[PDB]
A paper describes a structure:
To confirm the soundness of our virtual screening campaign, we solved the crystal structures of unbound hSPL and AfuSPL at 1.8 Å and 3.5 Å resolution, respectively. The structure of ligand-free hSPL was superposable with the one solved in complex with a known active site inhibitor with a RMSD of 0.36 Å (between 443 Cα pairs), suggesting that hSPL does not undergo extensive conformational changes upon ligand binding. Access to the active site is guaranteed by a deep cleft flanked by the last two C-terminal helices. The surface of this cleft is highly hydrophobic to accommodate the aliphatic tail of S1P. Therefore, the rigidity of the hSPL structure may account for the need to prevent a hydrophobic collapse that would close the substrate binding site. PLP is bound through a Schiff base linkage with a lysine residue that in the human enzyme complexed with a known inhibitor is Lys359 (internal aldimine). In the visible region, hSPL shows an absorbance maximum centered at 426 nm and a shoulder at about 340 nm, attributable to the ketoenamine and enolimine tautomers of the internal aldimine, respectively. In agreement with SPL being a well conserved protein from bacteria to humans, we found that hSPL and AfuSPL show very similar biochemical properties, although we could notice differences related to (i) an higher propensity of the fungal enzyme to bind the hydrophobic probe ANS, which may also correlate with the higher aggregation tendency and reduced purification yields, and (ii) some changes in the spectral and kinetic features, probably due to subtle differences in the region surrounding the active site. In this regard, the crystal structures of the two proteins in the ligand-free form confirm that the coenzyme binding regions are superimposable, thus further supporting the possibility to develop a dual-species inhibitor. Indeed, when C17 was docked in the catalytic pocket of both hSPL and AfuSPL, the best predicted poses were in the entrance of the narrow and hydrophobic channel. In both enzymes, one of the aromatic thienyl rings of C17 stabilizes the binding by π-stacking with Phe545(A) and Phe565(A) of hSPL and AfuSPL, respectively.
Deacylation of Cer to sphingosine and subsequent phosphorylation by sphingosine kinase lead to the formation of sphingosine-1-phosphate (S1P), whose irreversible degradation by S1P lyase (SPL) terminates sphingolipid metabolism. SPL (EC 4.1.2.27) is a pyridoxal 5′-phosphate (PLP)-dependent enzyme bound to the endoplasmic reticulum membrane through an N-terminal sequence, with the catalytic domain facing the cytosol. The protein is a tight dimer and belongs to the Fold Type I family. The active site is formed by residues from both subunits and comprises an Y-shaped channel whose distal part is largely hydrophobic.
Numbering used by the authors:
A (entry chain B): 106 to 553
B (entry chain A): 111 to 553
């Protein structure tokens, strides 16, 4: 926002040399130095030098590959097939399971939603509904908005799990899919997949499991020695699709994710086919046409580099860190932890002061946390980066000091960003907030 | 042969890279210049630069502008540069997207929501028959009706037919600069007349042509029609940096004449427990590496670079066009002024020519409705100097075929012809599903 350099607003009359381009780029990259010292929530999952170098070289070897042309790039076609099958194995899908590589968790979610809309249409459902917990990702609303589907969000329990009784009452003759999250992003709580799947089986409704965030942790937890309370994978009868982000705890480059299905019969509905196009018979498996095959190469590289032993070890370290932080953060007067988080995310509240004061303060001390709402809350997401750099001690100390400071003045009005997130929740005119967002989006592209 | 599960033990870097060389052992085909379109430069030094640029921004993600303010600036700049190239002026604006499909999808979604705002229940896209398949995806995904209007003998949209296709439900008009099948530019001024008269948004699909058409005049090859924001009624443009921008795959632009239109493409969830959610495009997390590399390509070529590149492509196109017009047995559809040349034949089955060119080691694009094949000339093709060889092989292929013009088409060539003549569209749809299934096979 406050840039210290003029904007390039047109193409240069004379193209720059390679060295000059890369030297000018240094000015932009030096601006982006907030994550390297382990002070950002989520965002960068490993960021390690030797890993980066491998992933960029792998990308580089496949820079011009485009899986739209599998006759030209059969090697890339085999890499993507292998990525999918590795994932189906990790989720114990067996030989009938299938999937596709996508650009991210959002596309993974949208693809399943679209698949289930088209199946519902085929069964005479005029306006399909998504039935989802309040905590399910925003991408489910985007799918509703994009694909013309009604979305019903059901309330959560005191422990921030979906209320299954309420979910039952939300089901109707028009329900196209059920959703649960492993875990939900806000508070890092795993929904009770078996209980939701019971409904899915009883009412004959597809069930999508959102494992975008947890996928490349939860798959390894048992082997890491941290067993979970609930099963989450294709072994659970009624689970019809899973989303999972390689680009989160797979340590794959950005622009990589999977949508997996229990059966090809489901995946078929996600496909787009135009048999009549002048430009040839056109069939795409996902949203994009042209895609960056380099990213798929690098994603395959991450997986083959970590292996089972690497992801188990990475999981062990993230979970050790999170369990330590969670037990400490439970013994601080003035805050509480929402629910009982078993993975990498911890959400905090305060019954004693405005919790956004803590996000404001920690921002000041060089930390970047996520700011939630409904109810008022903040979270941090623990990554390999955070375990590697051992920021856990300093995080705690800054949390403790901040809380003591706030506590000296518990009713002192809340300022800056914290104020906006507070007031936004109380504003009865939702369009005010919407209009505030559109200004923020515009401001992203500003060159003034 | 197939890796079907995670290795128990991770491979070392070197071992990973050594294994990956197995997958990259077919690139000589494209590298030799034998592939239609597909790779637009491929040039070694350019690749090194773009991969380094990507590498500097590998972990950047524009969902987090506060963390990566450098990427943010980069993307604002790519959009402003592109707006200048299309002479949009200060009120024009745009977004970086993942490719041309997403650019088309975004504009369609923008126009749908604006039509919803005016009480229209099922918004209609009015498009030429030649418009890209992505417009049918848009319709399918977003619940819009697509009306495809016929072409003239020159393969341009029939503008009278297009007017007759307009209804109270029309949300957008489309034309292409050029359309992908025949490489013909639609008469943008004439379509913009309708847009203005009936107050309908108009989207210009410049995904393919974008980073040629903007330089044509300066290359010394003035086009017949104007195409950019200076044309009254053009409300948006899609343009692929990953084609004639020579940018990495994963890179395209959607540009608007005014901010008011772009506001309709955005997604906002103010109520999400995870926080106020506002995304400009389809994706959430995105690869900022690709944007960095897209900026690098723009800054590396500059105006002089792209003018010179455009010169080299069009010289090659105009030569091949004049030569393919002087070959007994074949004709070229319409009058292509850019990088795509489409061939047909009234003397034999055109797919035989694709058969023989495939055997000679060339990969051309097979079209349909009507039976046709095309080549897309890229900067790679010009650097490799393949045009003469290309011509020689076409001539020999035609000469041969013309000895038995009425012989039965075999191979894929037959599939392409049968496909169009089948009465049950379904059977064709199923072959496609089966093809797509096969992409993901590990058997």
């Amino acid at each position: 926002l406050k840039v210290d350099k003029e904007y390039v607003k047109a193409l240069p009359s004379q193209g720059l040399s390679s060295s000059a381009v890369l030297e000018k780029l240094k000015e932009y990259s030096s601006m982006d130095a907030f994550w390297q010292e382990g002070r950002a929530s989520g965002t960068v999952y490993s960021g390690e030098e030797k890993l980066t170098e491998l992933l960029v070289k792998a990308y580089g070897d496949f820079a011009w590959s485009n899986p739209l042309h599998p006759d030209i790039f059969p090697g890339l076609r085999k890499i993507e097939a292998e990525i999918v099958r590795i994932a189906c194995s990790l989720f114990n899908g067996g030989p009938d399971s299938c999937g596709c590589v996508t650009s991210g968790g959002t596309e993974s979610i949208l693809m399943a939603c679209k698949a289930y809309r088209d199946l519902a249409f085929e069964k005479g459902i005029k306006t399909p509904e998504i039935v989802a917990p309040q905590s399910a990702h925003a991408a489910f609303n985007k799918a509703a908005s994009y694909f013309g589907m009604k979305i019903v969000r059901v309330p959560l329990t005191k422990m921030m799990e979906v209320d299954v009784r309420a979910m039952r009452r939300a089901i109707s003759r028009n329900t196209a899919m059920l959703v649960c999250s492993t875990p939900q992003f806000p508070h890092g709580v795993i929904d009770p997949v078996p209980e939701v799947a019971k409904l899915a089986v009883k009412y004959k409704i597809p069930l999508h499991v959102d494992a975008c965030l947890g996928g490349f942790l939860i798959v390894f937890m048992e082997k890491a020695g941290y067993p979970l309370e609930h099963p989450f994978d294709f072994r659970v009868k009624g689970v019809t699709s899973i989303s999972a982000d390689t680009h989160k705890y797979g340590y794959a480059p950005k622009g990589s994710s999977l949508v997996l299905y229990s059966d090809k019969k489901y995946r078929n509905y996600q496909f787009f086919v135009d048999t009549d196009w002048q430009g040839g018979i056109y069939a795409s498996p996902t949203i994009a046409g042209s895609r960056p095959g380099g990213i798929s190469a690098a994603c395959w590289a991450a997986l083959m580099h970590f292996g089972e032993n690497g992801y188990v070890e990475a999981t062990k370290q993230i979970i050790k860190t999170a369990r330590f932080l969670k037990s400490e953060l439970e013994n601080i007067k003035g805050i509480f932890v929402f629910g009982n988080p078993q993975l990498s995310v911890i959400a905090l509240g305060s019954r004693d002061f405005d919790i956004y004061r803590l996000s404001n303060l920690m921002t000041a001390k060089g930390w970047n946390l996520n700011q939630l709402q409904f109810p008022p809350s903040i979270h941090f997401c623990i990554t390999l980066l955070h375990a590697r750099k051992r920021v856990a001690i300093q995080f705690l100390k800054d949390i403790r000091e901040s809380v003591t400071q706030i506590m000296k003045n518990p009713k002192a009005k809340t300022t800056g960003m914290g104020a906006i997130y507070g007031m936004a929740q109380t504003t009865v005119d939702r369009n005010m907030v919407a209009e505030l967002s559109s200004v923020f989006l515009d401001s992203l592209y500003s060159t003034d």
